[PDB]
């Protein structure tokens, strides 16, 4: 039973590469990351960048999260982010996906002593 920052780490965190280089590399991930076990996820965001870079985010901008809440923060600098978004002809169990890579602020909720990201609400 994962903790909201395990979860977090697992879907979002990718240090290993600085950019997806692969019209691929969506469909890689979200298998590897076991984000397409019983369903295709249909919307994943995976970031670049150390873990304590995007850790550190939680002392940065605060801003309102998308429902409401008070407790998102947005990443001073960008950030080499990774959106996996399904595509139209994608179906269980042969999830499909589109791959964009871009720099963007991110924007995440944070929570928890430590205080850490424990979702992503958005890319700017
Ligand atoms: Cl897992
Ligand atoms: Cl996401
Ligand atoms: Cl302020
Ligand atoms: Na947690």
């Known amino acids: 039973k ?4 395990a979860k977090f780490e697992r879907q979002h965190m990718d240090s290993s590469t600085s950019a997806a280089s692969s019209s691929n590399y969506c469909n890689q991930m979200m298998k590897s990351r076991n984000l397409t076990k019983d369903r ?7 970031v670049h960048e150390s873990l304590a870079d995007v850790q550190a985010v939680c002392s940065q901008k605060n801003v309102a999260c998308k429902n409401g809440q008070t407790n998102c923060y947005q ?6 982010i990774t959106d996996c978004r399904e595509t139209g002809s994608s179906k269980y169990p042969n999830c499909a ?3 964009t890579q871009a720099n963007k602020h991110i ?11 424990v979702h992503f609400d958005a890319s700017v």
């Open 2 to 5: 994962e903790t909201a920052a």
């Open 40 to 46: 295709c996820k249909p919307v994943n965001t995976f």
């Open 75 to 80: 990443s001073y600098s960008t950030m080499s």
């Open 97 to 99: 996906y589109k791959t």
């Open 107 to 117: 924007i995440v909720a944070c929570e928890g002593n430590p205080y850490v990201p």
